[PDB]
């Protein structure tokens, strides 16, 4: 009601406001030890708990250094030697992450990790990836790296151990760039392998480390996908494309859940506003040169027609434009098309004398 | 080959602008070789349409 | 100061007098005190740590003993409270503006 | 001012921006300003090239 | 994080940059002998293994 005559002065400083979406470059590192049980939340590269084993500290050191940039966040978990797989999966389900590796794993451990990832990426609708020492999976989220007798720091590293450095290198690089032909100064020796059979190995969906020109460089980082179905793309078995698709999926899901679920009615105007918001997000993503701006978002007419015929109403009288504006109950259907860019990898040049 | 493998491999996205920049770089190298007087002065480099 | 030991509480009087003495145009950062002659020795990284804490401490550099980058006590920065609020000169001039208006 | 006028339930849909500014608001007065505060020099970066 | 103010002086020398091309004019000669097996690295005309 009435108050005393009150005058106030507000002191406010404008700050750079950018909506913050899902964080990329995070690494979930899991390992077994008898000291410092639980997650170690190593936010900074330099600081490491001292009670950890020297070997595992060294593997952490491989994880810390990055090809392009130091990984933004690292999460290291320590578990007791018995039941290595249960609570690791429980904590992974609890908290979001991007990449993972197992320096010490049994074959059953690898199989359990692969099956859990396949189950989660579909049932939970959570996009995650991991690097494993030796797998034969056909999924996009599993990376099969296999290079024997890696010798770094005058030390004999097995195929399963060096995957920590592989995962750190993959997570360190930004989305725009790619891992193909990235040199590792630390690696000094590799067993000699012929070019044709190494190419066959790459064709197997397998990731290998090969040597050419002056340095040791990765050869076309690709997923473990081997068989191509009609629905899924050949471009799926590339890494960068999967990474950017996962980023887009996570961002759109977060925005939708936070804003448009349960807060506004379902009408044609609200559908148009949601389409405009999604298009604005795609335009925002465009400037990062990840995708092209030609992408369009529109109402999926086929899905709406299917919904109405499932209801059983007769749509013959209604005009085709009217059908799109018809009420759809709780459900909302949208359709979009995009194109995903990639880095230049194959170049053909011809000159006329 | 050395310039391409060192600079423009796996570091820049495949797009029309990047292709134009690559053409500019190749043309600059060819101009440098022209200054050496080993090749003819007038050289043309462009994206191939048939392929 | 003056062949005498002083606690921090006792010397806060001199610190406040020094702060009030300076004009609005110039900042208290890097101003020498010819009265003090000695302070217990302490490493530079520790001084950086205390400055990061928001603690105002007396440091030794160059020829003369000087205060270093006097800052406001708050260390937690909220969305509304900007970085510039952490400086003494800025908050002082904002306060005088508020009072006059 | 728009929020205050809406709080009293007035129909401000058809009035112009200038009309909204000129509208009566009762005892309340709303104002906005922006200023930049200068600061004394703290850190100096100098790079010399041979 | 607020740091104690400091002055920094950087000394740098501008260097003329010419992109490095593949070295041309090098010679690799292979021969069979019982002494100094492997490469000899005769960069200079004057220095010869005995």
XYZ file of C-alpha atoms in Angstrom:
605
model
C 0.000 0.000 0.000
C 1.272 3.454 0.934
C 4.902 3.893 1.913
C 7.244 6.659 2.930
C 8.681 8.709 0.057
C 11.731 6.596 -0.758
C 14.500 7.328 -3.259
C 17.198 4.772 -4.045
C 20.164 4.608 -6.411
C 21.089 1.290 -8.019
C 24.725 0.487 -8.813
C 24.955 -2.138 -11.559
C 27.873 -3.120 -13.787
C 27.106 -4.689 -17.152
C 28.793 -8.048 -17.704
C 29.266 -10.100 -20.857
C 26.182 -12.345 -20.872
C 26.371 -15.457 -23.059
C 24.044 -18.398 -22.491
C 26.200 -21.306 -21.340
C 25.416 -24.700 -22.865
C 26.911 -28.135 -22.197
C 30.629 -28.004 -21.444
C 32.934 -29.758 -23.910
C 36.452 -31.086 -23.489
C 35.743 -32.787 -20.156
C 37.542 -36.070 -19.464
C 36.233 -38.706 -17.060
C 39.243 -40.763 -15.971
C 38.595 -43.948 -13.998
C 41.249 -46.138 -12.393
C 41.743 -48.546 -9.499
C 43.952 -47.961 -6.453
C 44.024 -48.492 -2.701
C 44.714 -44.808 -1.911
C 42.533 -41.698 -2.245
C 39.344 -43.656 -2.838
C 36.539 -41.981 -4.749
C 36.660 -39.240 -7.333
C 39.743 -37.026 -7.230
C 38.264 -33.926 -8.967
C 41.562 -32.828 -10.491
C 40.488 -29.485 -11.940
C 44.061 -28.275 -12.516
C 46.859 -30.173 -14.233
C 49.625 -29.309 -11.766
C 48.021 -30.424 -8.490
C 47.945 -34.206 -7.984
C 47.301 -36.206 -4.783
C 50.567 -37.650 -3.520
C 49.293 -41.020 -2.245
C 48.537 -42.138 -5.814
C 50.835 -44.716 -7.377
C 53.732 -43.426 -9.462
C 52.626 -45.463 -12.488
C 49.069 -44.130 -12.317
C 50.432 -40.634 -11.679
C 52.470 -41.017 -14.873
C 49.363 -42.093 -16.798
C 47.592 -39.041 -15.378
C 50.524 -36.982 -16.669
C 49.980 -38.404 -20.158
C 46.304 -37.481 -19.820
C 47.107 -33.931 -18.687
C 49.197 -32.777 -21.647
C 47.175 -31.943 -24.749
C 47.812 -31.768 -28.480
C 46.357 -28.276 -29.014
C 45.217 -27.118 -25.569
C 45.253 -28.547 -22.074
C 41.895 -30.267 -21.414
C 39.509 -27.876 -19.709
C 38.406 -30.287 -16.973
C 39.682 -33.628 -15.698
C 37.814 -35.993 -13.374
C 39.862 -38.895 -11.993
C 38.134 -41.694 -10.077
C 39.795 -44.235 -7.774
C 38.080 -47.539 -6.990
C 39.020 -50.555 -4.898
C 40.566 -53.484 -6.748
C 37.456 -55.625 -6.258
C 34.254 -54.914 -8.214
C 35.990 -52.467 -10.532
C 33.021 -51.881 -12.831
C 29.856 -51.318 -10.771
C 30.290 -47.995 -8.985
C 32.362 -46.589 -11.849
C 29.298 -47.000 -14.074
C 27.087 -45.645 -11.291
C 29.174 -42.469 -10.997
C 29.350 -42.104 -14.784
C 25.555 -42.271 -14.893
C 25.442 -39.742 -12.052
C 27.596 -37.067 -13.709
C 28.027 -35.931 -17.308
C 31.281 -36.403 -19.217
C 32.697 -36.658 -22.735
C 35.622 -39.100 -22.963
C 36.896 -42.011 -20.896
C 39.674 -44.598 -20.809
C 40.764 -47.620 -18.761
C 44.557 -47.889 -18.327
C 44.087 -51.158 -16.396
C 41.250 -53.327 -17.701
C 40.435 -56.997 -18.169
C 38.618 -58.195 -21.290
C 35.388 -58.562 -19.308
C 35.889 -54.965 -18.155
C 36.144 -53.783 -21.766
C 33.045 -55.756 -22.757
C 31.075 -54.356 -19.814
C 32.111 -50.790 -20.668
C 31.120 -51.255 -24.314
C 27.743 -52.800 -23.471
C 27.017 -50.078 -20.917
C 27.845 -47.345 -23.439
C 25.622 -48.941 -26.086
C 22.773 -49.262 -23.582
C 23.143 -45.715 -22.270
C 23.445 -43.823 -25.559
C 20.027 -45.188 -26.583
C 17.988 -45.781 -23.414
C 19.219 -42.763 -21.448
C 19.543 -40.479 -24.509
C 22.907 -39.321 -23.148
C 25.749 -38.885 -25.639
C 29.097 -40.123 -24.301
C 32.256 -41.575 -25.819
C 35.194 -43.581 -24.516
C 38.525 -44.985 -25.686
C 39.357 -48.644 -25.083
C 42.511 -50.647 -25.655
C 41.104 -53.424 -27.848
C 37.459 -53.676 -28.945
C 35.558 -54.812 -32.029
C 32.346 -52.860 -31.473
C 30.264 -51.371 -34.268
C 28.964 -48.322 -32.395
C 29.820 -44.682 -33.031
C 30.619 -43.900 -29.391
C 33.390 -46.506 -29.108
C 36.913 -45.831 -30.408
C 39.183 -48.769 -31.279
C 42.823 -47.692 -30.968
C 45.405 -50.434 -31.489
C 49.139 -49.758 -31.831
C 51.561 -52.278 -30.344
C 54.864 -51.768 -28.520
C 54.559 -48.004 -28.100
C 57.867 -46.696 -26.727
C 57.602 -43.296 -25.019
C 60.004 -41.993 -22.394
C 62.316 -44.996 -22.903
C 59.451 -47.113 -21.540
C 57.627 -50.105 -23.017
C 53.948 -49.131 -23.229
C 51.330 -51.728 -24.100
C 48.393 -51.063 -26.410
C 45.896 -50.698 -23.562
C 47.963 -48.247 -21.505
C 48.629 -45.578 -24.137
C 44.883 -45.129 -24.753
C 44.881 -42.611 -21.889
C 47.144 -40.322 -23.912
C 45.002 -40.991 -26.995
C 41.850 -39.907 -25.158
C 43.578 -36.845 -23.722
C 44.809 -35.852 -27.179
C 41.344 -36.320 -28.694
C 39.644 -34.277 -25.974
C 42.283 -31.536 -26.008
C 41.759 -30.517 -29.623
C 38.908 -28.109 -30.453
C 35.838 -29.050 -32.455
C 36.885 -27.137 -35.580
C 40.183 -28.981 -36.040
C 40.706 -32.716 -36.538
C 43.109 -35.352 -35.230
C 44.328 -36.518 -38.650
C 48.084 -35.997 -39.105
C 48.763 -34.741 -35.590
C 52.371 -35.224 -34.514
C 53.378 -36.660 -31.139
C 56.920 -35.606 -30.255
C 56.921 -37.928 -27.235
C 56.509 -41.096 -29.316
C 59.935 -42.075 -30.630
C 59.607 -45.653 -31.887
C 56.915 -47.832 -33.463
C 57.216 -51.383 -34.849
C 57.567 -51.189 -38.613
C 54.372 -51.935 -40.523
C 53.757 -52.059 -44.261
C 51.563 -49.377 -45.799
C 49.033 -51.630 -47.542
C 48.227 -53.755 -44.490
C 48.107 -50.657 -42.277
C 45.575 -49.274 -44.757
C 43.614 -52.516 -44.490
C 43.700 -52.141 -40.693
C 42.329 -48.605 -41.003
C 39.645 -50.010 -43.313
C 38.666 -52.424 -40.500
C 37.330 -49.466 -38.508
C 40.546 -49.654 -36.482
C 42.584 -46.644 -35.370
C 46.355 -47.068 -35.688
C 49.425 -44.872 -35.321
C 51.541 -44.624 -38.475
C 54.754 -42.867 -39.474
C 55.335 -40.702 -42.542
C 57.458 -37.669 -43.467
C 59.366 -36.126 -40.541
C 57.218 -37.028 -37.530
C 54.836 -39.627 -36.112
C 51.237 -38.679 -36.868
C 47.756 -40.092 -36.339
C 46.061 -41.536 -39.426
C 42.389 -40.536 -39.848
C 40.860 -40.819 -36.419
C 37.661 -42.759 -37.060
C 35.132 -44.573 -34.903
C 34.804 -48.342 -34.538
C 31.905 -48.416 -37.017
C 32.423 -51.005 -39.756
C 29.031 -51.879 -41.284
C 26.995 -49.087 -42.868
C 23.211 -49.299 -42.665
C 20.856 -47.354 -44.915
C 19.623 -45.031 -42.160
C 23.043 -44.164 -40.721
C 25.583 -42.232 -42.745
C 29.040 -42.994 -44.050
C 30.015 -39.695 -42.424
C 28.945 -41.164 -39.065
C 32.140 -43.212 -38.753
C 34.110 -39.945 -38.640
C 34.908 -38.602 -35.177
C 34.474 -34.836 -35.571
C 30.985 -35.265 -37.035
C 29.869 -37.447 -34.120
C 31.340 -34.951 -31.657
C 29.520 -31.963 -33.134
C 26.274 -33.945 -33.424
C 26.526 -34.855 -29.739
C 27.138 -31.206 -28.845
C 24.089 -30.110 -30.854
C 21.935 -32.836 -29.302
C 22.937 -31.955 -25.743
C 22.457 -28.216 -26.252
C 19.014 -28.535 -27.844
C 17.869 -31.021 -25.203
C 19.004 -28.750 -22.371
C 17.348 -25.675 -23.894
C 14.073 -27.510 -24.531
C 13.922 -29.050 -21.055
C 14.798 -25.797 -19.298
C 12.454 -23.510 -21.242
C 9.731 -24.997 -23.425
C 8.479 -28.047 -21.479
C 5.333 -27.493 -19.436
C 5.500 -23.688 -19.433
C 3.586 -22.712 -22.597
C 0.550 -24.044 -24.431
C 0.684 -26.092 -27.633
C -0.543 -23.917 -30.502
C 0.576 -22.995 -34.000
C 2.100 -19.720 -32.793
C 4.021 -21.470 -30.010
C 5.293 -24.011 -32.538
C 6.458 -21.137 -34.744
C 8.237 -19.514 -31.794
C 9.977 -22.784 -30.919
C 11.060 -23.172 -34.550
C 12.433 -19.619 -34.526
C 14.373 -20.304 -31.321
C 15.885 -23.495 -32.749
C 16.803 -21.653 -35.952
C 18.444 -18.905 -33.891
C 20.506 -21.514 -32.047
C 21.593 -23.035 -35.361
C 22.547 -19.569 -36.619
C 24.600 -19.076 -33.451
C 26.372 -22.380 -34.103
C 27.007 -21.337 -37.711
C 29.499 -18.588 -36.858
C 31.792 -21.209 -35.292
C 32.165 -22.628 -38.841
C 30.902 -25.999 -37.592
C 27.885 -26.175 -39.934
C 26.349 -24.190 -42.778
C 23.638 -21.545 -42.347
C 21.384 -23.031 -45.053
C 19.779 -25.262 -42.403
C 16.003 -24.927 -42.081
C 13.509 -26.073 -39.448
C 9.859 -26.700 -40.279
C 6.791 -28.613 -39.142
C 6.931 -32.278 -40.138
C 3.716 -32.635 -42.129
C 3.916 -36.428 -42.455
C 4.061 -36.961 -38.689
C 1.087 -34.652 -38.151
C -0.891 -36.506 -40.823
C -0.040 -39.811 -39.137
C -1.159 -38.453 -35.760
C -4.473 -37.211 -37.160
C -5.181 -40.479 -38.979
C -4.365 -42.340 -35.759
C -6.997 -40.165 -34.084
C -9.342 -41.149 -36.908
C -10.709 -37.779 -38.021
C -11.501 -37.159 -41.691
C -9.090 -34.571 -43.104
C -10.447 -34.598 -46.672
C -12.539 -31.456 -46.158
C -9.723 -29.473 -44.536
C -7.304 -27.631 -46.801
C -3.698 -28.827 -46.897
C -2.510 -25.631 -45.202
C -5.182 -26.081 -42.526
C -3.906 -29.570 -41.651
C -0.569 -28.110 -40.543
C -2.366 -25.659 -38.240
C -4.611 -28.392 -36.805
C -4.396 -29.179 -33.102
C -1.932 -31.934 -32.201
C -2.595 -32.400 -28.483
C 0.468 -32.846 -26.304
C 2.740 -34.060 -29.105
C 4.901 -31.716 -31.183
C 6.628 -32.794 -34.403
C 9.452 -30.942 -36.156
C 11.691 -31.574 -39.154
C 15.090 -30.081 -39.935
C 17.974 -30.511 -42.364
C 21.611 -29.505 -41.826
C 25.039 -30.085 -43.344
C 28.118 -30.836 -41.234
C 31.485 -29.436 -42.285
C 34.829 -31.215 -42.010
C 38.533 -30.476 -42.296
C 40.350 -30.887 -45.596
C 41.997 -34.306 -45.709
C 42.282 -35.255 -49.393
C 43.591 -32.829 -52.018
C 43.917 -33.372 -55.773
C 45.925 -30.870 -57.814
C 46.607 -30.992 -61.558
C 48.811 -28.570 -63.499
C 49.039 -28.100 -67.265
C 52.535 -27.545 -68.645
C 53.594 -31.124 -50.914
C 55.623 -30.038 -47.887
C 53.700 -26.769 -47.534
C 50.315 -28.483 -47.825
C 51.157 -31.262 -45.374
C 52.630 -28.810 -42.859
C 49.940 -26.123 -42.912
C 46.540 -26.973 -44.415
C 46.035 -30.611 -43.340
C 43.401 -31.408 -40.735
C 43.523 -27.933 -39.197
C 41.071 -25.904 -41.319
C 37.484 -26.758 -42.208
C 36.591 -27.631 -45.795
C 34.676 -24.613 -47.089
C 34.636 -22.302 -50.088
C 36.468 -19.529 -48.229
C 39.182 -21.939 -47.093
C 39.539 -23.147 -50.682
C 39.955 -19.539 -51.816
C 42.637 -19.010 -49.166
C 44.448 -22.145 -50.341
C 44.308 -20.859 -53.924
C 45.778 -17.555 -52.733
C 48.620 -19.375 -50.968
C 49.444 -21.499 -54.020
C 49.329 -18.422 -56.255
C 51.687 -16.595 -53.890
C 54.156 -19.481 -54.050
C 53.912 -19.534 -57.847
C 54.531 -15.776 -57.941
C 57.614 -16.304 -55.779
C 58.855 -18.911 -58.256
C 58.100 -16.431 -61.045
C 60.430 -13.941 -59.361
C 63.098 -16.660 -59.576
C 62.548 -16.544 -63.380
C 62.256 -20.331 -63.703
C 58.691 -20.317 -65.082
C 56.513 -17.998 -67.159
C 55.114 -14.817 -65.629
C 51.381 -15.415 -66.106
C 49.930 -18.329 -64.129
C 46.316 -19.197 -63.310
C 45.162 -21.484 -60.489
C 41.465 -22.170 -59.954
C 39.137 -24.796 -58.539
C 38.477 -27.661 -60.938
C 34.863 -27.860 -62.090
C 34.865 -31.110 -64.088
C 36.202 -33.253 -61.242
C 57.205 2.910 13.368
C 59.249 5.275 15.520
C 61.376 2.644 17.318
C 58.110 1.062 18.476
C 56.114 -2.102 17.858
C 52.516 -1.747 16.698
C 49.762 -4.294 16.277
C 47.683 -4.417 13.112
C 44.732 -2.890 14.980
C 46.842 0.030 16.208
C 48.237 0.711 12.730
C 44.780 0.576 11.127
C 44.379 4.142 12.405
C 47.383 5.278 10.365
C 46.167 3.238 7.386
C 42.735 4.888 7.503
C 44.285 8.337 7.857
C 46.473 7.629 4.833
C 43.446 6.448 2.841
C 41.422 9.543 3.716
C 44.355 11.869 3.039
C 44.717 11.004 -0.636
C 42.537 12.814 -3.206
C 39.993 11.141 -5.475
C 42.073 11.592 -8.634
C 45.077 9.538 -7.504
C 44.846 5.970 -6.220
C 46.424 4.595 -3.049
C 48.240 1.949 -5.103
C 52.045 2.181 -4.884
C 52.452 4.980 -2.348
C 55.493 5.056 -0.080
C 55.502 5.464 3.705
C 58.750 7.011 4.948
C 57.688 6.458 8.572
C 57.953 2.656 8.540
C 61.477 1.245 8.471
C 61.052 -2.532 8.609
C 58.465 -5.282 8.113
C 58.933 -9.043 8.681
C 60.286 -10.578 5.493
C 57.951 -12.559 3.259
C 58.107 -14.012 -0.246
C 56.396 -12.512 -3.281
C 54.288 -15.578 -4.106
C 52.813 -15.433 -0.605
C 51.980 -11.758 -1.170
C 50.239 -12.715 -4.409
C 48.284 -15.318 -2.437
C 47.125 -12.830 0.211
C 46.230 -10.255 -2.453
C 44.165 -12.966 -4.141
C 42.425 -13.511 -0.790
C 41.302 -9.874 -0.769
C 43.639 -9.192 2.158
C 45.395 -5.819 2.069
C 49.047 -6.214 3.074
C 52.181 -4.084 3.090
C 54.870 -5.162 0.619
C 58.489 -4.172 0.010
C 59.623 -3.276 -3.515
C 62.004 -0.799 -5.161
C 63.696 1.664 -2.805
C 60.827 2.559 -0.478
C 58.163 0.617 1.407
C 54.807 0.986 -0.336
C 51.246 -0.294 -0.210
C 50.390 -2.471 -3.215
C 47.064 -2.281 -5.068
C 44.593 -1.592 -2.298
C 41.451 -3.614 -2.997
C 38.056 -4.093 -1.407
C 37.664 -6.895 1.111
C 35.120 -8.931 -0.858
C 36.396 -11.966 -2.754
C 33.135 -13.529 -3.986
C 31.927 -11.960 -7.238
C 28.231 -12.276 -8.044
C 26.530 -11.691 -11.383
C 25.330 -8.219 -10.390
C 28.531 -7.235 -8.561
C 31.080 -6.574 -11.283
C 34.853 -6.761 -11.195
C 35.183 -2.968 -11.030
C 33.368 -2.945 -7.672
C 36.492 -4.516 -6.151
C 38.597 -1.334 -6.449
C 38.678 1.242 -3.657
C 38.750 4.272 -5.966
C 35.725 3.115 -7.966
C 33.570 2.343 -4.933
C 34.617 5.624 -3.299
C 33.646 7.756 -6.290
C 30.385 5.822 -6.673
C 29.582 6.490 -3.012
C 30.279 10.213 -3.315
C 28.126 10.328 -6.464
C 25.304 8.608 -4.584
C 25.550 10.988 -1.631
C 25.590 14.132 -3.774
C 22.700 13.006 -5.983
C 7.450 2.443 -16.685
C 5.807 -0.160 -18.924
C 5.799 -2.667 -16.063
C 4.303 -0.109 -13.668
C 1.571 0.858 -16.135
C 0.776 -2.814 -16.751
C 0.587 -3.438 -12.995
C -2.390 -1.051 -12.857
C -4.052 -2.901 -15.739
C -4.014 -0.072 -18.284
C -4.369 -0.984 -21.965
C -1.020 0.169 -23.366
C -1.103 -2.051 -26.464
C -2.042 0.693 -28.935
C -0.134 3.675 -27.523
C 3.147 4.696 -29.123
C 6.513 4.450 -27.372
C 6.496 8.238 -27.052
C 2.897 8.048 -25.824
C 3.946 5.520 -23.176
C 6.783 7.795 -22.060
C 4.409 10.777 -21.870
C 1.808 8.763 -19.935
C 1.057 9.683 -16.336
C 2.749 7.414 -13.793
C 1.538 8.792 -10.461
C 4.018 9.661 -7.732
C 6.638 7.173 -8.957
C 9.497 8.364 -11.175
C 11.732 6.018 -13.177
C 15.106 6.946 -14.660
C 18.062 5.290 -16.369
C 21.675 6.344 -16.853
C 25.052 4.973 -17.891
C 28.568 6.167 -17.026
C 32.110 4.790 -17.131
C 34.479 5.128 -14.168
C 38.142 5.846 -14.843
C 40.983 4.254 -12.891
C 44.602 5.078 -12.142
C 47.326 3.252 -14.041
C 48.236 -0.099 -12.478
C 49.897 -2.375 -15.060
C 52.047 -1.138 -17.949
C 53.077 -3.325 -20.891
C 55.947 -2.152 -23.096
C 57.540 -4.208 -25.875
C 60.588 -2.917 -27.757
C 61.747 -4.378 -31.070
C 65.402 -4.526 -32.096
C 42.293 -13.141 -9.690
C 43.826 -9.766 -8.847
C 47.623 -9.747 -8.978
C 50.038 -7.253 -7.483
C 50.825 -4.619 -10.135
C 54.073 -4.939 -12.039
C 56.025 -3.481 -14.943
C 57.268 -5.830 -17.662
C 59.917 -5.071 -20.286
C 60.168 -7.411 -23.274
C 63.119 -7.443 -25.676
C 62.521 -8.974 -29.104
C 64.326 -8.861 -32.446
C 62.372 -8.646 -35.686
C 63.514 -11.441 -38.002
C 63.047 -11.496 -41.763
C 60.948 -14.555 -42.582
C 61.414 -16.593 -45.759
C 59.425 -19.822 -45.877
C 61.744 -22.824 -45.974
C 61.618 -24.983 -49.099
C 62.948 -28.470 -49.738
C 66.733 -28.379 -49.928
C 67.997 -28.736 -53.496
C 71.545 -29.454 -54.602
C 72.259 -32.289 -52.153
C 74.043 -35.471 -53.244
C 73.746 -38.950 -51.735
C 76.492 -41.389 -52.726
C 76.547 -45.047 -51.676
C 79.665 -47.215 -51.732
C 80.850 -50.523 -50.292
C 83.831 -50.563 -47.931
C 85.171 -52.287 -44.829
C 85.786 -49.027 -42.924
C 83.551 -46.291 -41.493
C 80.451 -48.331 -42.271
C 77.229 -46.387 -42.579
C 76.871 -42.740 -43.450
C 79.916 -40.484 -43.232
C 78.173 -37.069 -43.327
C 80.707 -35.264 -45.529
C 79.100 -31.840 -45.340
C 82.371 -30.015 -46.061
C 84.569 -30.681 -49.089
C 87.765 -30.492 -47.032
C 86.964 -32.996 -44.271
C 87.464 -36.594 -45.432
C 87.590 -39.784 -43.319
C 91.051 -41.320 -43.253
